[PDB]
């Protein structure tokens, strides 16, 4: 089995900078006819992939000349000298020879300064509480890098169950991310505790960002 090990999986870049996506085969992919069938595709969010480079270093027709391929041994490289806002998305290498294998992906994204999440906890709505349910939502807005962690607590007691998180993609305006955790309980179960905490630990402070409330209000 041939393995296309593509790195890195995430490459934040500042506009106008040169990007370098690498892709390595677990052994030579040079075919019998002497040809190397190593292409590069880019899948922009919401659309299908599209051919960029074919035969290792050849640019497909209509492809921005800032794109270029190369690659020898088992190491191939995609370069985007001068990254524009249209180049952002997921890049894939692909050895379409023997058993066609895709690289893993390298999400081209924008780089900005680190930024701490801005947390906000919301108690269950009375209407949800009428149906017998009770979600406690925590928005962890506008941060960077995207790497963030959330721990819930009930009466100081950690609660790892029924918590459904969901992250937004990099914000187009400020290049930040936002996450959304949600502890869903039962009305009765909810109505048997006071303190509902959610602590966001991000790359910025070594101290979790705590957000709490008491049904005592």
């Amino acid at each position: 089995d041939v393995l296309m090990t593509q790195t890195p999986l995430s490459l934040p870049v500042s506009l106008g900078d040169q990007a370098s996506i690498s892709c390595r085969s677990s052994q030579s992919i040079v075919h019998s006819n002497g040809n190397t069938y190593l292409e590069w595709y880019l899948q922009k969010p919401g659309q299908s992939p599209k051919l960029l480079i074919y035969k290792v270093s050849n640019r497909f027709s209509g492809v921005p000349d800032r794109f270029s391929g190369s690659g020898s041994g088992t190491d191939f490289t995609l370069k985007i000298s001068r990254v524009e806002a249209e180049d952002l998305g997921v890049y894939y290498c692909f050895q379409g020879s023997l058993v066609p294998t895709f690289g893993g992906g390298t999400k081209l994204e924008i780089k900005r300064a680190d930024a701490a999440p801005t947390v906000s906890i919301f108690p269950p709505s009375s209407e949800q509480l009428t149906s017998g349910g009770a979600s406690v939502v925590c928005f962890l807005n506008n941060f960077y890098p995207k790497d963030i962690n959330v721990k819930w607590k009930i009466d100081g007691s950690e609660r790892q169950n029924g918590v459904l998180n969901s992250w937004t993609d990099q914000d187009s305006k400020d290049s930040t991310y936002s996450m959304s955790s949600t502890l869903t309980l039962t009305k009765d179960e909810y109505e048997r505790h006071n303190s509902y905490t959610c602590e966001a630990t991000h790359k910025t402070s070594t101290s979790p960002i705590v957000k709490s409330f008491n049904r005592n209000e």
């Binding site: 040809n35 069938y37 292409e39 595709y41 899948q43 299908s48 992939p49 599209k50 051919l51 074919y54 035969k55 050849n58 497909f60 997921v90 894939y92 692909f94 379409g96 058993v99 066609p100 294998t101 895709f102 690289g103 893993g104 992906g105 801005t118 906000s120 906890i121 919301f122 108690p123 269950p124 709505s125 209407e127 949800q128 149906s131 979600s135 939502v137 928005f139 807005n141 459904l164 998180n165 969901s166 992250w167 937004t168 305006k173 936002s178 996450m179 959304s180 949600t182 869903t184 409330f213 209000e217």
Partner: protein, 217 residues
């Protein structure tokens, strides 16, 4: 002029089989290899298999051997794929793309893709919940909406019929036991709300549902 059209969005119950089409045009169907690629909800691209029409040769990924059945009908210029014994892992987007011969030798044309959802879920309108900040007592005030327990995707959520858009953070829907859950955060200056009405308009087309939820205190 080469055009790859694929069948629509299919919602399949688990354990079933799903047959999808891919109508080619603008080129000789029988002279090129049609490839199929799978993309699970969150991961990269996976090569499934390939058929050469007009001789019906096939080549599968070991993983898909008994799972994906590639066929082609030259009089319909349509490649087909039947994914059977449907599991959760079969929920993904499927692309039929063409392997060009001379010039490029690569997947230069792709279809818009086919979205298959494997679930036992029945069609369910959402439950839209207002998320007012905790209790009484900064410069900006974060509000939100919780849209949960719906089937199937998608839903559309706007803030104030759309007047509010900056500061809005709509997070990706996630399935938590047969149904979907989506949430949205709207950050507006203190002097805007409650001084101003901030309604959350949720539409679930599959259920012919348009719901407004005004965020009161």
């Amino acid at each position: 002029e080469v055009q790859l059209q694929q069948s629509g969005t299919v919602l399949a119950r688990p354990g079933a089989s799903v047959k999808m089409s891919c109508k080619a045009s603008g080129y000789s169907f029988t002279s090129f290899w049609m490839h199929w690629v799978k993309q699970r909800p969150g991961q990269g691209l996976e090569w499934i298999g390939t058929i050469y029409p007009g001789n019906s040769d096939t080549s599968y990924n070991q993983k898909f051997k008994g799972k994906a059945k590639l066929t082609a009908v030259t009089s319909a210029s349509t490649a087909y794929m039947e994914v059977s014994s449907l599991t959760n892992e079969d929920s993904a987007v499927y692309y039929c793309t063409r392997r060009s011969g001379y010039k490029y030798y690569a997947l230069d044309y792709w279809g818009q893709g086919t979205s298959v959802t494997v679930s036992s879920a029945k069609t369910t309108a959402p439950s839209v919940y207002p998320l007012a900040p905790v209790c009484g007592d900064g410069s900006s005030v974060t509000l939100g909406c919780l849209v949960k327990g719906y089937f199937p995707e998608p839903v559309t959520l706007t803030w104030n019929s759309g007047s509010l858009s900056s500061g809005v953070h709509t997070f990706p829907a996630v399935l938590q036991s047969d149904l979907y859950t989506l949430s949205s955060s709207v950050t507006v200056t203190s002097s805007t709300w409650p001084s101003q009405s901030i309604t959350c308009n949720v539409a679930h087309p599959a259920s012919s549902t348009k719901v407004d939820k005004k965020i009161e205190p």
